[PDB]
């Protein structure tokens, strides 16, 4: 460990927006933390990014203002960024920089960890099999998820995704309720939440919701407003992810990370790239943002020899309700699945307006079946899905021509669409439904058709369950 | 004559991408050829691309690899690439750079000519007057080609254009048999087939089919596999054009040159453009594609005081059915007329899939007529086109209306259409077809109808074959 006095320089050679270029620094370190002292005396921090001979550049996490070519000092610790982390972080609140904001004490660290963390060896990773209860009807049964499974939430401006996040974080539970309840109740879910580029109103809505739940015994909150500087957002997610790693792989608990507004992260990275004059990719975003999103989306899954788990549940906004926009596409190439909250459903006041049609959850493949959830599950979702798609086709054909050309089968499809939207989609504010109930509701929605119409269902299962 | 010994250097500042930058070059010359030597005694070649006083630049053909700062040597030849052009290559095969691949020796050429070539006197050009025998009924009957006429062949990726080209190679001839069999003994005809960027499988297909046909006494096969150097791709067409000009003019021949996959040629042009550090133009292709493609296309025609002609037939791989793509647009602009193929006909298992409805030959009216051939060929093609159009139209009306409202003449049109794709369009792989018997077949098809509705042809010429 380092056992030498710190070092200080004063040669400042320019400021280019959120960057500060400087000269005559001996033996610097790439990715090294720098402190700053202003003429007025305030303190600041930064990160060395570029290095070339004696000249080096940094990035002030809180912007540049009042800096001077000769009346500002800088200090090089000659060490990679080491963050503090303890189990005591539960129940606390902080800003992006990690300093307290809720009047509480300074951080009292249990250990120093690396911001970049480390690349986990894939062989230790245990493939998830548990299927987590969500309470939501659209996610359970149809696009379910697992413990350790990283799923995003696609949404847009003005959509009510915030309370969807509230619901999914509040109604967390396990679906293995068919056994003794006492051993079931031992399990809880530590939550770590990292606001980022989020206005005051949504932040207070979330903290009031958490206070209503009374779950601050196991909630860590990192906060960011709009008025704060922008470059904090470059490092804000990583702090939360590292703390989640420590709370999972060392404290043995089950953690659930929440990330907010990744398009803001992309915007901040693009701003840094615009300052850094590197080669721009499509829509001006740097080429290596793919690898950056990879590095921030891989800290998930459980590991051998332990029993904790890490589930990634980010939310991101699509400008102009676009799907081929860069950030949605690249996130689709990193994350395994999608949800696609839709504006059209929200226009007719259906809450939550979850569009099942473009959704996907690959890891449903082995997360369901006899013993896990129910003998007869997947084909029900497939039949409902194909019926929904064909019903939407019939709806389009009705729009093009009119009800005159529709057959009786088309009428059956249309009433299926109506009932499907009315019952299965619409749930309500705090309607915590069970898995068996949603399966029963699916069977109910299937009942309207006779045996002949269904095509993607085994006849044995139909004879087993349909006649009741 | 070059009486100046060659110069070999050893100093080099470095290299850059696939190029090679050195210094202290005594009197560099643009487009100068050079050989290279590696530490392990490996020999390569190159061409000079940029010059600035003593700082020369050269692209290595084989591909930069294992190059050392000091233990490498270049050796200038002091001259642009010099084609070993001559008459005796017929019956030989060469690779990209002309090195023999048929187990032959270095060509003992009697002439050394510039690879790039020169333009022709626009004053010295003749109007084409005869036709060329192709052997495909759909080609000669509808869109017969002339001496000097330039016709491309549009085709989608994954169609049997290559096999059609090979058939045209092994089938193309003259039409002197019409005047007299004895006159055909003046076999001045020749073929020059150049394939670029083609998978080894179809290159083997070409060479095996040629060797089977046993007609390489009048063939010049250039071949360039896909894995070969990118630079050599833009070299082969110039060599082929030089040899074709030599045969057609200096050896008074009638040479049918054919070129394949100019889309990949455009990609090679893009490669060199990227190497040139010139900003790309529309759709990424360089803005000077026009001049290069024009210099490639225009090397043909007949000349005064000469007995010979050149006829070019390129094959363009239409990207994803995009008529508005720049390459096909400009190729249509330069050349005269076009011929289309169809995916649906290929799906119908009718070979060759040639669509004559949009096909058009520019100057067919003078390529055909009495004296050159039978007098009423153009009349017959016009009749077949009009009848095909009427048959397609009545079939389209049919498909929604019904046979209940169909008249006998329309049944005759349907029969003619069906027999037409069954027989005339259908060719088969090894069916040597001549113009006279194709005319007989067309007459037999036309004889299904009486004279009443065969209106477009005067009766004075209908008496020639209708009453048979």
């Amino acid at each position: 460990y380092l056992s030498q006095p710190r070092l200080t320089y004063k040669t400042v050679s320019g400021v280019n927006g959120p960057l500060v270029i400087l000269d005559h620094v001996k033996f610097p370190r790439y990715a090294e933390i720098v402190h700053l002292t202003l003429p007025d005396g305030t303190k600041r921090s930064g990160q060395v990014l570029e290095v070339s001979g004696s000249k080096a550049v940094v990035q002030v996490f809180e912007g540049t203002s009042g800096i001077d070519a000769k009346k500002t000092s800088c200090e090089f610790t000659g060490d990679i960024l080491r963050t503090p982390v303890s189990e005591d972080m539960l129940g606390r609140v902080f800003n992006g920089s990690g300093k307290p904001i809720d009047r509480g004490p300074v951080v009292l660290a249990e250990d120093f960890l690396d911001i970049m963390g480390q690349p986990i060896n894939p062989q230790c990773r245990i493939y998830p099999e548990e299927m987590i209860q969500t309470g939501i009807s659209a996610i359970d049964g149809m696009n379910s998820i697992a413990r350790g499974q990283k799923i995003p939430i696609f949404s847009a401006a003005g959509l009510p995704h915030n309370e969807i996040a509230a619901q999914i974080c509040r109604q967390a539970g396990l679906v293995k309720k068919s056994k003794d309840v006492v051993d079931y109740s031992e399990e809880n879910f530590a939550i770590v939440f990292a606001a980022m580029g989020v206005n005051m109103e949504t932040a207070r809505f979330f903290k009031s919701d958490f206070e209503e739940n009374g779950s601050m015994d196991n909630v860590c909150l990192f906060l960011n407003l709009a008025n704060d500087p922008t470059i904090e957002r470059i490092i804000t997610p990583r702090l939360a992810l590292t703390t989640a790693e420590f709370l999972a792989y060392q404290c043995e608990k089950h953690v659930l990370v929440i990330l907010t507004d990744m398009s803001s992260y992309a915007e901040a990275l693009r701003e840094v790239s615009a300052a850094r004059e590197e080669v721009p990719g499509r829509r001006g975003f740097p080429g290596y943002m793919y690898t950056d999103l990879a590095t921030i989306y891989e800290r998930a899954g459980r590991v051998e020899g332990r029993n904790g788990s890490i589930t990634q549940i980010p939310i991101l906004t699509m400008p102009n309700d676009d799907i081929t926009h860069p950030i949605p596409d690249l996130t689709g190439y990193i994350t395994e699945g999608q949800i696609y909250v839709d504006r059209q459903l929200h226009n007719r006041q259906i809450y939550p307006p979850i569009n099942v049609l473009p959704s996907l959850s690959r890891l449903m493949k082995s997360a369901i079946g006899e013993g896990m959830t129910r003998k007869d599950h997947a084909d029900v979702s497939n039949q409902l899905y194909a019926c929904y798609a064909i019903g939407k086709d019939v709806q389009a054909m009705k729009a093009v021509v009119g009800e005159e050309a529709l057959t009786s089968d088309d009428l059956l499809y249309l009433e299926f669409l109506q009932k499907f939207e009315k019952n299965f989609i619409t749930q309500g504010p705090y309607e915590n439904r069970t898995v068996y109930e949603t399966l029963d509701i699916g069977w109910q929605l299937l009942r309207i058709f006779p045996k002949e119409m269904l095509k993607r269902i085994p006849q044995s299962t139909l004879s087993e369950f349909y006649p009741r | 004559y070059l009486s100046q010994p060659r110069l070999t250097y050893k100093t080099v500042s470095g290299v850059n991408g696939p190029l090679v930058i050195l210094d202290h070059v005594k009197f560099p010359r643009y487009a100068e050829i050079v050989h290279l030597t590696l530490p392990d005694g490996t020999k390569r070649s190159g061409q000079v691309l940029e010059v600035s006083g003593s700082k020369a630049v050269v692209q290595v053909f084989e591909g930069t690899s294992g190059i050392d700062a000091k233990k490498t040597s270049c050796e200038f030849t002091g001259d642009i690439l010099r084609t070993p052009v001559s008459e005796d290559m017929l019956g030989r095969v060469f690779n990209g750079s002309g090195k023999p691949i048929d187990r032959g020796p270095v060509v003992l050429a009697e002439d050394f000519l510039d690879i790039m070539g020169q333009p022709i006197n626009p004053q010295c050009r003749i109007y084409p007057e005869e036709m060329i025998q192709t052997g495909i009924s759909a080609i000669d009957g509808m869109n017969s080609i002339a001496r000097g006429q330039k016709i491309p062949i549009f085709s989608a990726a994954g169609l049997p254009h290559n096999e059609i080209a090979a058939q045209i190679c092994r089938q193309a001839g003259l039409v002197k048999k019409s005047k007299d069999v004895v006159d055909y003994s003046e076999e001045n005809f020749a073929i020059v087939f150049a394939a670029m960027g083609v998978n080894m499988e179809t290159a083997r297909f070409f060479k095996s089919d040629f060797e089977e046909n046993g007609s390489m006494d009048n063939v010049c096969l250039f071949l360039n596999l896909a894995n070969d150097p990118t630079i050599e791709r833009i070299i082969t067409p110039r060599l082929a054009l030089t040899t074709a000009e030599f045969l057609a003019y200096q050896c008074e021949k009638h040479v049918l040159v054919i070129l394949t996959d100019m889309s990949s040629y455009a990609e090679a042009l893009r490669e060199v453009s990227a190497a040139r550090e010139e900003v790309p133009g529309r759709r990424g292709f360089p803005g000077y594609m026009y001049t290069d493609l024009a210099t490639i296309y225009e090397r043909a025609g007949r000349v005064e005081g000469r007995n010979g002609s050149i006829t070019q037939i390129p094959i363009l791989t239409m990207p994803n059915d995009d008529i508005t793509h720049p390459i096909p647009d400009l190729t249509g602009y330069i050349t005269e007329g076009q011929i289309y193929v169809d995916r649906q006909l290929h799906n119908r298992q009718i070979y060759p899939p040639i669509n004559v409805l949009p096909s058009l030959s520019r100057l067919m009216k003078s390529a055909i007529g009495e004296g050159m051939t039978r007098k009423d060929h153009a009349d017959v093609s016009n009749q077949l086109y009009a009848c095909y159009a009427i048959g397609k139209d009545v079939q389209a009306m049919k498909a929604v209306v019904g046979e209940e409202a169909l008249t006998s003449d329309d049944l005759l049109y349907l029969e003619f259409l069906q027999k037409f794709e069954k027989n005339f369009i259908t060719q088969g792989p090894y069916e040597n077809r001549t113009v006279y018997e194709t005319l007989d077949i067309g007459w037999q098809l036309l004889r299904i109808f009486p004279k009443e509705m065969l209106k477009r042809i005067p009766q004075s010429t209908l008496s020639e074959f209708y009453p048979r």
Binding site: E277, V279, P280, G284 | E277, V279, P280
Partner: peptide, 18 residues
């Protein structure tokens, strides 16, 4: 195209530093 032109010019002027 404009963005690529701008960065190419930037690289060029950087090249003529000496």
């Amino acid at each position: 195209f404009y963005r690529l032109k701008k960065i190419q010019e930037k690289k060029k002027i950087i090249k003529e530093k000496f």
